[PDB]
Design a binder for this molecule. Structure first.
Ligand code: B12
Ligand code: SF4
Ligand code: SF4
Ligand SMILES: [Cl-]
Ligand code: NA
Length: 698
């Protein structure tokens, strides 16, 4: 939570006030090492698990280089900006660039590399002694942070390669250059008693590097002696939109298992705020996921042909792809395992829940919750062989990763960066859950993660039962009171016993009932302007998933879409002013209509041009080029009818209109749009459902 907005600050400058520190042109080099853990790891810890994912990311530090197209901007200052903004987008804490000199190119480094992108990732917060999970995490920060450096270095390496320039990533596990030296030269750190010290990162950090012949404007080293200006009043208050100087210390007062956002102040309820009738919920084949439908031909030729490609049109997304795909085989086991003895005392489920949450926040989740994995949350059958899926684990641990407010401010929602937002949050989530599930397995509890590339559960109902969101108008997206609908979830299921969270009520039903903004702004009118309906046993505002799927897969003026998330009033900057509007919305019902109307009069959702840090590049046949058909640049739309609720006819595809369990990708089942439209018109009202259920319980 900042005090001042960053709405006028370009993304390449990052969340810290690096531009206010004292700098000089050059410094004298000297021996230096990276920060290490204070304490050593206890015997059984997370160490083995973060090391496995670090080895995996090591494989993608190099790779093939695409041919050079003609759309890469020449100016090294503009390349520098974009690459620093890319690194902040992946959650580097600090970024700089320096020139590579002959002492660096003389080792195993490719001799055509002239430049280095240098980035730091801050150590995560550790639990205190005696807190749940302390022994899992204590002493693993170098390795946990290295794994994240490797991930970032691989993704960015891969981006530059796909732009057509050779590039290689480096980190402590695998480096051909002196990392520490470069961090000094690029102006991230200074040396104290042979150890790097970085302004603002008081917990310690580790480094990643990308070397490349892609020429870039270089930064200047920090002044080597004395105070740099990190406590000047402008910096302490963060007037330009940066982190206040006391934010770290205020956050450290909260125990790590509570997260950064105060989810403890939200009202909990036993039953969710919308009707869920478990006995009437049928399980759905994986083959009914509408992307799988698209893949198999159910939605027509165009959609079939675009399905592999639609989210991989931008080079940055293609940098992520190999990590995403190769995490899949590590997702874990469905079989029961024997407890192992490792992991300290596991007999208290309340403490286990705290430990798992802490672990999630240590690895970088924004929200962690836990619910029972009910059988109706698992798909009925897989889509490749058509075999039944068993409800094999008892618990679902559900994490939210924020898609990134600032990037989205700059975007249309359906332009060239949309899919990269999705993919970054899927990638990061899969990494976190992979590690966490792996840790459960090392303790002898079966655990398996469920990513965008391979999932056997439907995230939504778990997000709901874990109390991380309420049902919203957008439809197939649940909304959180602090980051709104701006998230991707990741889930791992496991048998580790844990107390469960409970659903939340923060007044969203009433708020969404007076708002239509997401619906108004959807490019294909997929989002309902009317009332909630019953759908496969539960109450929901059902969007038209056919129309949405066709637009996201097929539209040629960007890479997919998430405009609905962008335009929602609950999607807000992490500032005091933002948080206060969220609190008003929750605590003061009379204010909601006013907030809804003012969100428009203030032009929230307008594209903010300062935040547009990315290049409009479309990869066609292995080469990046300017967008063939152009680029979506949408603005706010005017109001629709008072009568649009009554006139819009959407289709819905509950189980009866889906491919049945057992169907694979080899079969085709053309979508029955007629039937889906008539099914929507026949859907039961929630009110009638409530009364029908009451009439049985007499
Ligand atoms: C396929 C898919 C889509 C497709 C097709 C949807 C469909 N229904 O087939 C389309 C393209 C429409 C789509 C769009 C988007 N999606 Co999508 N999608 C998925 C995916 C991969 C599978 C859904 C599914 O398996 N099939 C659909 C069958 C099962 O659906 P159904 O019978 O219609 O049921 C749906 C809902 O009713 C709900 N649901 C099921 N049972 C229950 C029970 C209860 C009680 C409740 C309340 C809800 C609920 O889950 C289904 C979601 O599609 C999930 C990931 C996952 N494994 O769940 C992400 C997922 C739902 N998508 C998500 C998002 C964010 C998007 C987009 C915003 C795109 C983006 N840029 O990120 C848009 C939002 C569109 C909208 N209006 O909501 C997020 C939602 C997270 C959240 N905060 O709740 C998910 C969970 C991915 C993730 N891991 O974060 N998506
Ligand atoms: S519902 Fe689909 S198409 Fe509509 S705005 Fe959301 S993501 Fe885009
Ligand atoms: S835009 Fe309005 S209606 Fe749509 S989800 Fe957000 S609050 Fe609800
Ligand atoms: Cl999606
Ligand atoms: Na908004």
């Amino acid at each position: 939570m900042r005090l001042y907005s960053n709405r006028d600050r370009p993304n390449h400058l990052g969340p810290l006030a690096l531009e206010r520190l004292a700098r000089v042109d050059d410094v004298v080099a000297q021996p230096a090492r990276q920060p290490e853990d204070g304490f050593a790891a206890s015997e059984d810890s997370l160490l083995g698990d973060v090391e496995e994912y670090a080895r995996l990311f090591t494989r993608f530090l190099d790779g093939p280089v695409a041919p050079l197209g003609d759309a890469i901007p020449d100016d090294p200052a503009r390349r520098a900006e974009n690459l620093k903004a890319s690194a902040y987008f992946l959650d580097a804490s600090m970024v700089g660039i320096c020139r590579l000199d002959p002492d660096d190119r003389a080792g195993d480094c490719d001799p055509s590399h002239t430049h280095a992108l240098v980035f730091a990732v801050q150590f995560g917060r550790e639990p205190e002694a005696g807190e749940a999970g302390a022994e899992w995490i204590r002493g693993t920060n170098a390795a946990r942070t290295d794994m994240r450096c490797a991930e970032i270095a691989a993704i960015l390496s891969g981006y530059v390669r796909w732009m057509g320039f050779p590039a290689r990533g480096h980190f402590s596990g695998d480096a051909q250059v002196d990392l520490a030296r470069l961090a000094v030269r690029a102006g991230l750190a200074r040396v104290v008693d042979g150890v790097l010290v970085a302004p603002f990162l008081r917990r310690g950090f580790r480094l990643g590097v990308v070397t490349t012949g892609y020429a870039l404007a270089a930064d200047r080293p920090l002044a080597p002696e004395g105070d740099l200006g990190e406590t000047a009043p402008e910096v302490m208050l963060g007037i330009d939109g940066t982190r206040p100087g006391w934010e770290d210390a205020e956050e450290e007062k909260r125990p790590l298992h509570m997260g950064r956002y105060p989810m403890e102040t939200i009202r909990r309820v036993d039953e969710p705020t919308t009707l869920v009738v478990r006995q009437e919920i049928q399980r759905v084949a994986k083959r009914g996921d509408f992307f799988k439908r698209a893949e198999a031909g159910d939605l027509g030729e165009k959609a079939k042909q675009e399905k592999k490609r639609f989210p991989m049109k931008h080079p940055l997304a293609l940098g992520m792809q190999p990590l995403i795909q190769n995490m899949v085989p590590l997702q874990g086991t469905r079989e029961k395992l024997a407890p192992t003895g490792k992991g300290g005392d596991l007999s208290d489920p309340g403490r286990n829940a705290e430990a798992i949450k802490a672990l999630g926040y240590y690895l970088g989740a924004d929200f962690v919750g836990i619910c029972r994995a009910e059988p109706w949350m698992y798909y009925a059958s897989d889509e490749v062989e058509g075999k039944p899926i068993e409800a094999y684990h008892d618990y679902a641990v559900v994490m939210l990763i924020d898609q990134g407010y600032e990037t989205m401010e700059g975007a249309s929602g359906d332009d060239w960066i949309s899919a990269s937002q999705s993919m970054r949050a899927y990638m990061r989530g899969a990494e976190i859950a992979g590690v966490m599930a792996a840790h459960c397995r090392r303790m002898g509890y079966s655990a398996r993660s469920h990513s965008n590339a391979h999932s056997e559960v439907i995230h939504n109902p778990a997000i709901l039962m874990a109390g991380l969101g309420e049902v919203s108008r957008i439809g197939d997206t649940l909304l959180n009171p602090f980051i709104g609908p701006r998230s991707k979830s990741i889930v791992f299921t496991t048998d580790l016993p844990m107390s469960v969270d409970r659903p939340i009520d923060f007044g969203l039903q009433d708020f969404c009932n007076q708002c239509r903004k997401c619906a108004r702004e959807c490019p294909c009118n997929a989002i309902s302007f009317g009332d909630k309906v019953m759908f496969n046993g539960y109450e929901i505002w059902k969007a038209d998933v056919e129309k949405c799927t066709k637009y996201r897969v097929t539209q040629m003026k960007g890479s997919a879409c998430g405009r609905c998330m962008k335009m929602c009033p609950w999607n807000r900057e992490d500032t005091v002013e933002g948080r206060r509007l969220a609190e008003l919305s929750i605590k003061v019902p009379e204010a909601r209509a006013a907030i809804i109307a003012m969100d428009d009069a203030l032009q929230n959702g307008k594209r903010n041009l300062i935040k547009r840090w990315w290049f409009d590049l479309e990869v066609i046949d292995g080469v990046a080029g300017a967008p063939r058909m152009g680029t979506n640049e949408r603005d706010l739309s005017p109001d629709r009818g008072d009568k649009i609720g009554a006139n819009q006819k959407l289709a819905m595809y509950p189980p009866r209109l889906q491919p049945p369990p057992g169907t694979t990708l080899d079969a085709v089942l053309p979508v029955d749009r007629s039937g889906g439209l008539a099914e929507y018109a026949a859907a039961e009202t929630p009110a009638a459902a409530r009364a029908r259920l009451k009439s049985s319980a007499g």
